[PDB]
Amino acid sequence: ATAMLGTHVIWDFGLQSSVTLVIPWISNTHYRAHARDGVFDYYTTGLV
Amino acid sequence: GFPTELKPGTNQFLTTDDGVSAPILPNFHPTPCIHIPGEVRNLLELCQV
Amino acid sequence: GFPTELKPGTNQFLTTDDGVSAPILPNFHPTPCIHIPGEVRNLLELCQVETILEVNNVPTNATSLMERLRFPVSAQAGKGELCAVFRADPGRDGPWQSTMLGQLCGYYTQWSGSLEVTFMFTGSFMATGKMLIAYTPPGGPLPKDRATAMLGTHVIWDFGLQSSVTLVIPWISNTHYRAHARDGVFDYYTTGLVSIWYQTNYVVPIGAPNTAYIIALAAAQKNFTMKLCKDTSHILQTASIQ
Amino acid sequence: GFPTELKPGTNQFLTTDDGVSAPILPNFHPTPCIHIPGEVRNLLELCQVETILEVNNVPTNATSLMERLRFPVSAQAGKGELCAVFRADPGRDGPWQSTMLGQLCGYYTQWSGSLEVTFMFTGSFMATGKMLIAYTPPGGPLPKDRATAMLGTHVIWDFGLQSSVTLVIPWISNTHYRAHARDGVFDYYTTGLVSIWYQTNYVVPIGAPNTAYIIALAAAQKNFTMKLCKDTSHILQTASIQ
Amino acid sequence: SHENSNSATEGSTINYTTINYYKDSYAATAGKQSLKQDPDKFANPVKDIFTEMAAPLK
Amino acid sequence: SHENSNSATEGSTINYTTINYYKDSYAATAGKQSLKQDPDKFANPVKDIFTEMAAPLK
Amino acid sequence: SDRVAQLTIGNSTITTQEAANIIVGYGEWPSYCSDDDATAVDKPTRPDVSVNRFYTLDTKLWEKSSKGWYWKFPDVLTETGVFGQNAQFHYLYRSGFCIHVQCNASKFHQGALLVAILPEYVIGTVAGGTGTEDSHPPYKQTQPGADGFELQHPYVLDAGIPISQLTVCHHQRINLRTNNCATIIVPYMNTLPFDSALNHCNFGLLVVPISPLDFDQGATPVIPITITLAPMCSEFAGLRQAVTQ
Amino acid sequence: GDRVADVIESSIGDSVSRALTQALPAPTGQNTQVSSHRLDTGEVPALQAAEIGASSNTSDESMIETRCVLNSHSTAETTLDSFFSRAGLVGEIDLPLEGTTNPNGYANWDIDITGYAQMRRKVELFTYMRFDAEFTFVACTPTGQVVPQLLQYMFVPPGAPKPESRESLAWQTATNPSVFVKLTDPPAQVSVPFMSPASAYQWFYDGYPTFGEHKQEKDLEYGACPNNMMGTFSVRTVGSSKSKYPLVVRIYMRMKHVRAWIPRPMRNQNYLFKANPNYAGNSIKPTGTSRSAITTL
Amino acid sequence: LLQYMFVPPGAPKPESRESLAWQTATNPSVFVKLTDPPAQVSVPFMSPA
Amino acid sequence: EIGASSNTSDESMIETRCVLNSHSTAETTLDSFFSRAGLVGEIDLPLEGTTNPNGYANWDIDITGYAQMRRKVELFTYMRFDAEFTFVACTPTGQVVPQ
Ligand SMILES: CCCCCCCCCCCCC/C=C\[C@H](O)[C@H](N)CO
Ligand SMILES: CCCCCCCCCCCCC/C=C\[C@H](O)[C@H](N)CO
DSSP: GGGGSSSEEEEEOOSSOOOOOOOOOOOSSSSSOOSSSSGGGGGOOOOO | OOOEESSSSOOOOTTOOOOOOEEEETTTTOOOOOOOOOOOOOOOGTTOO | OOHHHHHHSOOOEETTOOOOOOOOHHHHHOOOOOOOOOOOOOOGGHHHSSSEEEOOOOOOGGGGGTTSSSSEOOOOSSSEEEEEEEHHHHHHSSGGGGGTTTTTTTSEEEEEEEEEEEEEEEEEOEEEEEEEEEOOTTTTOSSSSHHHHHHSSEEEEEEESOOEEEEEEOOOOSSSSSEOOOOOOOOGGGOOEEEEEEEEEEOEEEEEEEEOOEEEEEEOOOOOOEEEEEEOOOOOOSSSOO | OEOOOOOOSSOOTTTOOOOOOSSTTTTTTOOOOOOOOOOOOBGGGTTOOOOOOOOOOOSGGGGGGGSSOEEEEEOSSSOEEEEEEEEEEEEEESSGGGSTTTTTTSEEEEEEEEEEEEEEESOOOOOOEEEEEEEEEOOOOOOHHHHTTTTTEEEEOOOSSSSSEOOOOOOOOOOEEOOOOOOOGGGGGGEEEEEEEEEEOOOOOOOOSSSSEEEEEEEEEETTTTEEEEOOOSSSOSSOOO | OOBBSTTTOSSOOOOOOOOOSSSTTTTTOOOOOOOOOOGGGGEEEEEOOEEEEEEEES | OOBBHHHOOOOSSSOOOOOOOSTTTTSSSSOOOOEHHHEGSSSBBBOOOOOOSSSSSO | SSOOOHHHHHTTTOOOEEEEEEEEEEBBBBOOOTTTTOOOOBBBBTTTTOOOOOOOEEEEETTTTTOOEEEEETTGSSSSSTHHHHHHHHHEEEEEEEEEEEOOOOOOOBBEEEEEEEEEEOOOOOOOIIIIOOOOOOHHHSOOTSSSEEEEEETTTTTTTOOOGGGEEEEOOTTTTTOOEEEEEOOOOOSSSSOTTTTBBOEEEEEOSSSSSSOOOTOOOOEEEEEEEEEEEEEEEOOOOOOOO | OOOOOHSSSTTOOOOOOOBSOOOEEEEOOBBBBOOOOOOSSSOTHHHHOGGOOOOOOOOOOTTSSSOOBOOOOOOOOBBTTTSSOOOOEEEEEEOOOSSSEEEEEEEEEEEESSSSHHHHHTTTEEEEEEEEEEEEEEOOOTOOOOOOBEEEEEOTTTTSOOOOOOTTGGGGGGGSSEEETTTOOEEEEEOOOOOOOOOOESOOBBOOOSSSSSSGGGGTTTTOOTSSOOOOEEEEEEESSSSOOOOOEEEEEEEEEEEEEEEEOOSSSOOBBBBOOOOSSOOOOOOOOOOSSSSSO | OEEEEETTTTSOOSSSTTTTTGGOSOOOOEEETTTOOOOEEEEEEEEEO | OOOOOOOOOOTTTBBBOOOOOOOOTTTSSTTHHHHSSSOOOOOOSSSSSSSTTTTTOOOOOOSSHHHHHHHHHSSOOOOOOOOOOOOOOOOOSSSSOOO
C-alpha cells in the first residue's frame, strides 16, 4: 500500500515475457558519486 | 382578464356538432395506411350498383 | 362583452392535457445548467443496451437467485440434444422481464422492430464446442428435435477467441406493430420461440471443468419503436407504504 | 357564439397572478410625480450598505442592549488568544439578523455571492495592536488555536490612521445558490465561521484607557443575488393588534 | 393605439412591457421593469470619490 | 415579443414549439422536442471504435 | 493491436496483454471546470502528477461462494497519498477516475465478473426482514473505505434494484478465457461542479461474479481480484484545517 | 507568464468536454437495405465480444437475406416530454372532522413525490432530473361528494414560518404564494418552475448532508438531499370556526420541459418507506415468473 | 366527482374502488363533476393494423 | 468614518478565478417584491352581536392593520402605486352561500 506511492509498473505475464522499469533520474545534484555506509549514503539512488 | 360574456348555446351537447376536442395521448403517430382496394369515398358510388 | 359559448369538454381535468397554466412565482429565473454527462434525450437510447436475460428462471428460493442469470452446457452423447428454449416476446412474462427492454416495453402497449440476443460463453479456453441457436417463427410448436429447428432462422456458433455471437431475431410480422402477448386471444401477437441445441458437443480436455455456463444478453436494433404509452402491468405494490 | 371550453385553473384566486383587472374610475389621471431623492429601483442597492453586526449578542436585559453592538479588545498575555467568533450565515439566527441584509434575505429563500465584514476600531490614537480575522470554510470545527485558523482565509489588521479593514468572505460553495442554514439537515448550507484572534496584543501607554471596543459592519458585494421570495420567519406577532 | 396614459409610472424613462384590454393604463399588468441600479447613491454618496487601491483618508 | 427566458430548457440547442399567454416561460406548453438520439453514448462508449464486419478483439 | 494496452498517467504505468479495450464513460472524457459552470471565485489548485496517478487499494479473494464486493468513490482515497491529504485540507473536490480491475487466472480456470459503475449507489437494508422496522445502514457499510464491503444480497444489489439491468451503466466483463483486465474511465458525474469528498460518494464500483469460478483439484485455488485506480483532472478548492470525516 | 516547456505543452485547464459521440437526427426508425448471400473469409459480423462492454453493432442486413423496408415509424413517443408529461398522484391530504391525524382543520404535507409507487418508479429510472411542473388539486369529500366550501392552498418554502393552527398568522400570504378555491369550481392548477439551488434534482444522494461524527442516533440523515426539500404545502378551511364537511385533497403532478441524466436500473421489489431504498429480506421476489424446467416452456 | 380511466390492453385492470391503478401515472384519466357539462375527448386511430 | 461603504472587491483580497456570473437581478425589483397579494383587512357581518349587527359594515382604508403586510411597506417612507384589491367572502365556517 505504501510502495504504490513511488514510481511503479504493473507487469502482466504473457507473450511478451519482459518489462522495463526505467528508474528515472530524480536527484538534487547533476551527478552523484558512489554510495556507501556512512556520510556517503547521501548519494543513494533509492530502492527497487 | 379579457372581457367575454356567455351567449345561449352553452353547456349543451349537440351530437351533430363538429368542434375541436381534447386529445388523450400526446405525440401519438398512428399506424401508416396501406393500399387496400375498395376505398369508398362517397355513398353514391354504392347506389349505382 | 365578446360573445362566446361554452362547448362540451369543460371543467374537466384530463391528465394528458398539455396546456398553459398559472405561475406562482413571477420573475423567477432558475439555476443555470451545467454539463452533466449522460443526457438521455430519447428512451430508445436505452433499449439498444445489452441487459441480462434470465433464461434459467427455474430457481425460486432467495439463496439461488444468482443461479438464474446463467444456464449450463455439459458433455452429452451427441444426439443433438436440447439445452434451453425461451419465448421471444418481450412484453410477456418470462425471461425478458429482467431487461431494460422488458421493463420499458411494459410502459408501452405496441412495439415494432427487430431484437437481438447476444450469448456469451464463460467456460475454459481449452474447451471447444458448437451450438445451434434457432428462431422458430409463430405457428411452430416446441420443436421435438434439431432436424425441424434448422428450418427456421438459425445461427451456428463456434466457441473460440470471440466468445459471443448475436442472433438477430428479425421482424417477421403481418402487422406493422404488435402488442403484448398473453395466454388467450392475444397469443395472436406472439413473436415465436428461440431454442438452443447442441450441434456437436461440448468437448473438454483432462484437468479442465466438465461443465460451463452461458450468459444471454438481450437488446434491440436501430429500427425498434414503441407506441401508445400505458401503465406497467408486471409489477404491483402491497399497501401501507410508510 | 365563439366556441370555447374552460380548462382547469378557473375560478381560483392565485395571489402571485399578474393579470388585467377592472378599473373603478374611468378617465382618472393621477397626480404627476416630482423629483424625490432616494428612488429605490432594486432592493440589491440596499444590501450593499454597511449595517452593524451584533456579534456581542450576550446581554439580554433592556438596560444593556446597547452593549450588544461593540465587542472589546484588551491587554492579554500574548498567547494568541481568542477575541470573538461568529457564523457567516446571514439568513440564520444570530448576529446578521441585526442587518438590512439579514432582514431582506429573510424575505428570500436562496442567496448567492460574496459578503464583506468591515471592522472598525474605536480606541485611542496612541493605542496600537494587531488582529487576525480568519474565515474558516465549512467542515472546519471551532478552531482551538490560531495555528489552525491561519490555514483558512485570513487578514492581518494593523491599527493606525485607517481604522477599518474589510474581510471579504468569498464565495466558496459547491452550489450556485445556497438556502438558509439551520440546525438539522439544512446545516449542509452553512457558509462557515469567522473568528478574530489577537496576533500580537493590544498595546497602550500610560494615561490611556486599557480597554477598547470594535464595531463590526456587514454588507454585500456587487455579485450578490437573491431568489425565490417568501415570508420572513425570524419575526412574529402576538395577537390583539389594536 | 389610443389609450389614456394614467398609470403611476407615466413620466419616467423606465421601459415596461404591459398587457391591457381597457382604456385605463392603471389596469395593466405589472410587466417587466428595467434592470437598472444605482448602488453608489446609498453606498458611496461622497462629493469627491476615492479609488479602491488608494487610502480613503489621505 | 418580450418575455422572460426562465424555463428549465433555456440554454440548449433543442428546438421547441411552445404556446404561452404569460410573461413566464415555465408556464408554456411542453411542445415538440427535437428528435435527436445519441445511442453510441451508452451502447458503444469505447475509445477506439471497431467496425461491424471486423473482429472486435483483434 | 488491441489486446495490449499501456496506461501511463503520472509516474505510474500498467501493462496488459489480455485487455478488452478502454471504456470511456458516457462518451465523455474528464475535464476541468469552465468559467461558466464554476461559481466559486477562489482559485483552485491543480496538482497534476502527484494525485493523478494509480493507487492500488487491496486484494479480494474470489472463491466458489463469493457474492460480491462494492467500493465507494472517493472514500477509497481519503487516507491514501497526496490525494487523501489535499482532500482532508480542502472542502471541495472534482475529479474523474480510471478504474482497472485485475484478475489473472489460467486457461483451465473459468468464470466471469461484472465490473459496473453505478452512480449515486444508495445502500438499503432488509428492514428487519419483515419490512416493518424503519432501519438505516451504519457508517462502516455506507462508506466502507478501501477494504470494501461484501454484498449480502447481490440479486438486488443491497438497494432493491436488479443486477440484470446494471449493463445500462458503465461496465465491462472479466471473462477468464478472453481477458483479465477491465479499464473503465469515468468523468465527474454530479449536479454540482464541485462537491465534498468526505460526505458525498459520487459512484460505487460493483464487482459481481455472475458465473462462479470453477477449476479442477490440483490447480491454483487462490484467485485474487485487485482494484487499481487513478484520479484524472483533479481540482481542489476551499482550504481549511484537516478533518477526517 | 509561461516560460518552461512543461506548462506550455500542458493539457491543464482544458475546459472543453471532449465528446466521442454526436447526436444525429432520427425522426423515423432506420430503413433496411437489401442484402444477399456472403461466402467470404475475414468478414464476420455475427461474432462480437461483450467483454468489451459495448453492445452489438450487428444489423439484420448481415445475418439474413433482407428486403428494402422504408420504415416510416416515428420515435416521437419515446421522448421524455411524452413519457413524463402525464399527471400522476404524488400526494393525498385528508382533512377529517374528528380524528387524530389532522383534527384542527389544517394540514401540512412535506413535498415528496416518493410516496406513491406508480410515480416513484418512473422518475427513479434516472438519477438526475430537471423539470418544471404543473400541479393540480382535486378536493372532495371521502364519498366523492362535492360541497360548497372555500379553501386556502399555501406554499411554504423552506425557512418560512410554518402555520401551527387554523387561525395562525402565516395564512396572510404577503410573500408566500397561496391559492383560494371553492370545491364546486374546477380543480386548481398552477405551474411551478425549477426551484433547486443546484442544476438538477436527484432522487438518490449517496452520502450524508452534514459533517460530523456519524453515529447510530443521527443515522436517518443518510440519503437526505437538502437540494430537494422544496418546502411544505399547507391547507386550511378558511374560517374562524370548525367546518362541517370532511375533505380529502389529491395532488397530481405533470412534468414539462424535462431533461434527465444517468439512467439507472429500475426497481423490482416493493417499496416500504419514503426516500428510502429499503426492502424486505426474507421475501426477496424475483424479477419475473418461474418455470418447471428450462427445456419445457 | 368521477374518474374515467382508459386502461389499454396489458395494463393492470383495477379490481376495486381503492385500488392502485387509479393513480393514472401513464394511463390517461379524466376527472369530472356531474354538475359540469359532459366530458369530451378525441381519440386517435390506435390499431396495430 | 467617511460614512461610505467599502469598495473592496475579492479580486483585491484573495487570488480569484474568472467566474462569468449569469445570475439575474430581476427578482429583487419592487414589482417582484410587492406584487404579491396580502391580507390588508378583514370585515365581519354577524347576525347577532355588537360590532356590526345591522347588516352593514364600514372599514376605514388602512393597510397598517396586519403585521405581515405593514412591515414590507414600512421599509420605505414614500410609495407610489396602483393597486388591485380582491374580496373573498365566506361564512365563518368557510361555507359558501347563495347571497
Ligand atoms: C400553491 C401551491 C403550490 C405548490 C407547489 C409546490 C412546489 C413543488 C416544487 C417541485 C417539486 C419537485 C419534486 C421534488 C423532489 C421530491 O421532494 C423527492 N422526494 C426528491 O427526492
Ligand atoms: C369597490 C371597492 C373598491 C375599494 C378601493 C379602495 C381604495 C384604495 C385606495 C388605495 C389604498 C392605498 C393604501 C393607503 C394607505 C393607508 O391608508 C395607510 N394607513 C397609509 O399610512
